[PDB]
Symmetry: D2
Subunit: 447 residues, 4 copies
């Protein structure tokens, strides 16, 4: 049966496919052939621009026009053509080569030099750079902006919930009070950390030739330094320079990228589980509309997808850097999957966003929940005792905590203590709700 969203095996190209559309221009075969074409053209132009090669004479403005436009206007029909040529070639890169060959066929300047397309390059010279462009383009145009959307969402929830008291939960149970603003502030913080780390990750490439030794480049063209040629070329593409390679690129940097992305996804998983929890306690209710509990599912699915993402992200990151000797092709097919994990991630991200849009806080439920546990108020008293020398605070506080613990019992206990009456007054001005320690200011320090 023909391919559609209904007939698709993978939900990424499946029911969730219209979310991931931006990756169809990148990690698909269309992206592969696209960046292959770009890189090949850039390679030819780079040749013609070198004075030491008289075989490719420097291009006129118009021919450069045809090439640049060939790279910029590249579309799905062209990819189709390459795929059709691949039937005859049986090599998918040589198919690109022929595609370009027949595209320049009518332009004398280009056709005459057309045999210098993919000159001295091995296939992975084109492939690894195509990949690099895939991952970089994805990172900047897609991933990072989403990370920013989520981050800003959590920051928003942090400013909105800033002064809202909350009864904290340690090993599932009531604990020293906080605010939701802060609980979001932490997530935002860690997310920002990973963001930074991901923007600082290196993205690497090479054209080294066959084994990386510039063998045929130098054998054919001793007049050139192909090291400088290679650096200039790889840097010309907006990529980073990896002078030491076997036939392939060792792939370490993709392990790095996917590691970071995985960390982010993990933090987000923690967030989704936590919000799932807060909803379970009815700390959250549905927002009114123009179109009531919140169905958690937006986060749920997100969580469910995030792991899946990691599942792939990890594996590649683990597998790719290992390739037998000078190379094995086990990586090639795997490198077709670069955008699957990311895809999952994307979905998850969006889901979370949606979830956040549905969230409204339930204030009076939290206020009451705090009102009903006055035991958290033992602690600050204890400290204020530990300062003034009152002996065995943990011994004396048991005379209270086990069991009514109202505000009356509390203030009575505080009255029965030996203490400067200013501290008595203060302690007696305490409520579990009002007592956040430093939360709010910390929430405000985030920006």
């Amino acid at each position: 049966m023909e391919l559609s969203s209904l007939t698709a095996v993978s939900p990424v190209d499946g029911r969730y496919g219209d979310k991931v559309s931006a990756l169809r221009g990148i990690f698909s075969e269309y992206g592969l052939l696209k960046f292959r074409v770009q890189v090949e053209v850039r390679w030819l132009q780079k040749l013609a621009a070198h004075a030491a090669i008289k075989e490719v004479p420097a291009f006129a403005a118009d021919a450069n026009g045809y090439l640049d436009t060939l790279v910029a206007n590249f579309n799905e029909e062209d990819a189709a053509r390459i795929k059709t040529i691949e039937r005859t070639t049986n090599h998918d890169v040589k198919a690109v080569e022929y595609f370009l060959k027949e595209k320049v066929a009518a332009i004398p300047a280009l056709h005459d030099v057309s045999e210098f397309i993919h000159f001295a390059c091995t296939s992975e010279d084109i492939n690894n750079l195509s990949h690099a462009l895939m991952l970089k383009t994805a990172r900047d145009e897609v991933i990072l902006p989403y990370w920013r959307q989520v981050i800003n969402a959590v920051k928003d929830l942090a400013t909105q919930y800033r002064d809202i008291p909350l009864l904290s939960r340690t090993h599932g149970q009531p604990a020293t009070p906080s605010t939701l603003g802060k609980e979001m502030a932490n997530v935002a913080y860690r997310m920002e950390r990973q963001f930074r780390q991901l923007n600082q990750v290196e993205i690497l490439g090479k054209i080294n030739g066959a084994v990386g030794n510039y063998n045929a480049h130098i054998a054919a063209y001793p007049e050139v330094d192909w090291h400088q040629f290679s650096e200039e070329f790889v840097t010309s593409l907006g990529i980073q320079w990896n002078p030491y390679t076997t036939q392939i690129e060792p792939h370490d940097y993709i392990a790095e990228l996917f590691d970071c992305i995985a960390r982010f996804n993990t933090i987000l998983i923690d967030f989704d589980r936590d919000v799932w929890g807060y909803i379970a306690l009815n700390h959250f209710k549905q927002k009114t509309i123009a179109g009531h509990k919140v169905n958690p599912i937006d986060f749920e699915n997100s969580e469910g997808n995030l792991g899946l993402s990691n599942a792939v992200l990890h594996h590649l990151a683990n597998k790719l850097p290992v390739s037998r000797w000078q190379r094995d092709l086990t990586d090639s097919t795997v490198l077709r999957n670069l955008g699957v994990g990311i895809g999952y991630a994307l979905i998850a991200y969006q889901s979370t966003l949606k979830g956040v849009s549905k969230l409204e806080v339930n204030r009076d439920h939290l206020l009451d929940e705090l009102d009903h546990n006055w035991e958290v108020l033992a602690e600050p008293i204890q400290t204020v005792m530990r300062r003034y020398g009152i002996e065995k605070p943990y011994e004396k506080l048991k005379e209270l905590t086990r069991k009514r613990v109202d505000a009356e019992g509390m203030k009575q206990f505080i009255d029965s203590l030996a203490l400067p009456e200013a501290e008595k007054t203060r302690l007696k001005a305490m409520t579990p709700a009002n007592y956040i320690g430093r939360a709010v200011t910390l929430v405000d320090e985030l920006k």
Copy 2:
């Protein structure tokens, strides 16, 4: 960009799609809806068959026929229509109910009972069964056949190469010889162990209720036994029963299934790697001086297989863990049931293609064998030990030291205290002559 095999973000529906097309009728959304319609229809049919339920009267051949054809003739436009009934439901399982009602409103008998569709059913009552049908159907129509073709390729090689002596590699270094056929035979054995293991795995399903206690069922129909209803209904689908569940089937059996599949995948990775090594050793040549054979289909296999496991294991580890009576993290996860099976598919096909290309180089293996005569030290020790000579290892710490040949072996042999029959036996020995029992071991696979 519109969705094509070109614009697919993933190679499964991507470049490798024409391989996995068989899964499109199972694990896709189309398969999900297909088995949902199947389950709902069959369920209403059981509702009708029952004597205790008089509100749903028995069907004559006409309506039963219309339903059977509803299930069997279910197609892509039906599913597309169900997808169109969304944007309304916002609920994916309810769209099926609407679809069934409207489909069925033409025939009066099913028309008047049409509100008994999905009766006292939670969504997951349908979903889990649909998944079970997915897995069973995939296993029967795809997985096992392919496993069999693989084991048959491996066994083919085993039989062809049965008599062909091979210099073994331990620590990638020369060891006591063998036949290539034996080395294939082993992988075949492991494979078929995993095969009989997979055929023997339970595909589980349960329809009980929202929380699994048959609440609403008893609420409406207290005089009906819903446990017998459950067991019967689940077995009737070719599934097997889980009496005890929460709102969801706990998913353990999918963990088990994907675990077996993952083990098979592992064995096949061992095989692909090994054959890669043999090709690298120039032990294999091209089918028709000899020509190099390019083991891409093996690499392409071993690259995909791992990926397969990567997802498989995940669904094995993640799925069974669900908060309290349930959380929906599985709902989306279970749409991925076909991914690792897809990768596995592609790897299987690849490996088959790569075995199709295999020729053996006999002159080479014999040359290599004859260049290592040191392996004949071992059988000389053992005999020397049986006949009571002392310090055999140290006495062969004489013979080992230039490189060994047949002449030297004969000198050493004659230099020893042995029954002379045993001597001549030892001198009858060559690296190729010493395969142990391997030939008969290949012969004995049944």
Copy 3:
């Protein structure tokens, strides 16, 4: 800094090491040399048994006495002697070999045959059977008993709370009522499944010799049938037999076993998180209430994570060995118990966690009484049976719910009065569906 529970890097032989003591006779090096010695000895014995080998005559009752006692009494000092021989020999199997040849010389009839020890065998022939004995022993004497204890704990919670009604949570929000006994019974059922499965798993072994072809065996003794020898020996060791093999046992059965174990562990993780939750809602208390600290369940959770980590890794990596073999597995197998150990620390902990559990009835009942919206479900079905128009619109409009709200709404409909007395009978507490009898049929 010599070795103590204190100075240990790993908590397995570390702080948690007095839990794992049962595994110190199995998966350690002491265990390794123990089972190696056993396998070697019995190999010798079986060589003596065979009639076609006259070079070692049969063992009388006394020599079998010395060998059997040699194997049975194996202690740490013996293992230290072996370990000492390992310095001179620099092959850890050859030290066991020299240790047996050494010990056996007390008896003349054995010393005569001392050179038939490890005859035709290759190291892995001994090592792999040693592993088999390791995993079998571990399974029967350790793992299965615990699994049974846990299962019986959960079952006890099931029989206890069987009648106790509980408000369900689907995606964390309230749902159709149930009993705790049920939710415990499900866990008990899954655990039962994995228990049966772990019982079913094969423990595999071989002595095929060097590369698995019986090269040397056949070279020395073309008379003997060494396949019957392999089968007979391997089965006599209590181990199931793998006929087709390279220098190593492919380890697949270890993958199967560890897979089952990890599945069980995962079930247990689900359980622990679930009890964490139930406690977090104050559904559980100690034995005014008293909050119970759910520490044993978290410490179970983590160590289960680690356990599954190791078990998984070994299961996936082990079966892959390059060509006829690579020795990468040789070291990894020293970790066969590691993951298991982790599991142990969980199994015990969860137990200690369950012993501290007592249910809060009043809390559950008061939670149920504050949700009558669950009763929205059953009514609907009844409405659907007697053919009331479009129920879900009506009910979903009808709902801040009371008893009288319900009673009123039920009286607002056209149904047999029988069904109105049936429905007016229901409370969210009263409405458990079939749960009780479902619990009753567990065992």
Copy 4:
């Protein structure tokens, strides 16, 4: 059965545990107690040193001296005492407090402030910083030195062998020639790339108290800035500050760490494997031809995977804790030095293996000498330069079963139409001088 390296379940404290001895002072319960005592003592010190706290007046060096000698001179029996106190308290953190107070009871100056030990802190304030010191300590003192030793080993294999020609293998089969030096140089480059990263990884601690809001701190001493207090105190430890936290540090930097470490481990896995391969080709030999055992690369390769499994697990699970915390991490953090532990063993083994490596130059040169077909490519390229039509199919018209030698190439290119300079350029080419730029890249690694 008493604990000895013999009875140990794990080889880390087991058979392989004499290699890991360093970690015994870091990641153990001993190290936990040591660093705990350290951070508690320093906490008390900073408490005293603060003016806004009058109830802990500034120490003399008659006092802080004793404290410092408490931290620095810590030994095994202090840890033992603390353990015996954990026997009575049942809380393992409280025993550091008791121990500290029974140590301090003698000096009345400290004994009088002794109730301020661990003031306002909650257990993970101590624990997390203890962890930070564990990781940093191991990282500077243990891990990095080893990474350096390995990087230098490989660098030496690269610089020694730089000009030794080697026939490359892509998909296992002969490819464009290279040098050993280049092939090791790659590994060196990657390894260093990781080294820098691990060195640049942040290490974090918090000490904000219970939920991280400084609740009790401000309760007792509202006048102080405890954010200042926190930043300062955490930076004074040699660690980096994490202002935003729940009861526990998120354990992200642990993820980063173990990710980098796992990456390095993976590079070393690739290396061990490749070397295993080269040894399998007889490309390496012993040192005063003798056959070499790759048991060290098999051991390293073996333990690295376990290391990555553990580290990976800690990295994935640790950062996830329910709400303000779950204690599932508390036990898991006892395992911090397990993964590293494995790594350590590996790191050693590999080195040992590298110490056994000699190159066989003759074997390599000969294998190259049988491989002349590799010289095809350069010719093609040259042919493509001077415009010779369809170059690649002009060759490959040598698939000939006369194979290929120097005379064949010579004659062939003699037939070609080329300026004589390029002809003799190509005739001068042999597989062994065709290594290209390898030697200069190796040189430039410096």
